[PDB]
Design a protein around this ligand. Structure first.
Ligand SMILES: Cc1oc2ncn(CCCN(C)C)c(=N)c2c1C
Ligand SMILES: Cc1oc2ncn(CCCN(C)C)c(=N)c2c1C
Length: 279
């Protein structure tokens, strides 16, 4: 399948070269997989989600996304126009309030929730969790991310936006999850992207168009935007049977475009997520 005039990040993940604008992908499109977006919520009524999104948990007085960040990330995972895996099921877990803030205790509870809740959901092709959030190092936060991964969920986490080594951030620094840095449309490391040996992969993160609250769209930047590209890619590859939740991060690294990014610090992987789709 081909989506013409796609957002640059979708085109990038299906291309061996920067500078193209069509997204190519197998029409299975993540059908039968599920992606949990652990964030500020998801505006599930957005036409772009086509009934495939739903809120399943909140820790606040409402399950509504009053911020937009979670809706944007969910859109990059799985919206019809802006999403990598256009037929996946999206589940919202609101661990962040409408200012984008959340206590580590709440974030941990949300991860443990997903590890159990996937057993209440029909996801025969596999389960992914996208965590576009984090803060300073916490062994308890890292352990929660490790538990979620061990339970059989592909966990993709944002590296962070401090232009610093991700070893000092959580859950970014948990080795067993998939830690995602950000790149731009010219194949440069995004100016704000964290780096370091704990990174597994880069995805598009500068100037990413996706869904927003109020039934709208906008372009924003962050490792938060790169992470759902990788989460959606994992769901897509799991639906194709090419990999599993336990192996998808390694598979994405194995099949990535290698050596193509600039301003990668020595010791950080030079790997850009790539779907390897051949029509
Ligand atoms: C106008 C705008 O509104 C935003 N809300 C959340 N974010 C994401 C930053 C923090 N996040 C965890 C809540 C934005 N980057 C953003 C931008 C730009
Ligand atoms: C380790 C980590 O530390 C963070 N601090 C703020 N944010 C919010 C910035 C979100 N983005 C859209 C600009 C994070 N997403 C984050 C992550 C991951």
């Amino acid at each position: 399948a081909a989506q013409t005039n796609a957002p640059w990040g979708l085109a990038r993940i299906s291309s061996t070269s920067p500078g193209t604008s069509t997204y190519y992908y197998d029409e299975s499109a993540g059908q039968g997989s599920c992606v949990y977006v652990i964030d500020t919520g998801i505006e599930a009524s957005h036409p772009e989600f086509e009934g495939r999104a739903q809120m399943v948990k909140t820790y606040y007085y409402s399950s509504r996304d009053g911020n937009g960040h979670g809706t944007h990330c969910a859109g990059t995972v799985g919206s019809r126009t802006y999403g990598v895996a256009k037929k996946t099921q999206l589940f919202g877990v609101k661990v962040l309030d409408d200012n984008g803030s959340g206590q580590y205790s709440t974030i941990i509870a949300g991860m443990d929730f997903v590890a159990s809740d996937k057993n209440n959901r029909n996801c025969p092709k596999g389960v992914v969790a996208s965590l576009s959030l984090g803060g300073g190092y916490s062994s308890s936060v890292n352990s929660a991310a490790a538990r979620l991964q061990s339970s059989g969920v592909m966990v993709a986490v944002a590296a962070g936006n401090n232009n610093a080594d991700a070893r000092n951030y959580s859950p970014a620094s948990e080795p067993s999850v998939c830690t995602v840095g950000a790149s731009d449309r010219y194949d440069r490391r995004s100016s704000f992207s964290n780096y370091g040996s704990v990174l597994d992969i880069f995805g598009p993160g500068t100037d990413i168009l996706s869904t927003w609250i109020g039934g709208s769209t906008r372009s924003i930047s962050g490792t938060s935007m790169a992470t759902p590209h990788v989460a959606g890619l994992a769901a897509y590859l799991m639906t194709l049977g090419k990999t599993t939740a336990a192996s998808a991060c390694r598979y994405i690294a194995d099949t990535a475009n290698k050596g193509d990014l600039s301003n990668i610090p020595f010791g950080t992987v030079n790997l850009l997520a790539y779907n390897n789709y051949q029509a």
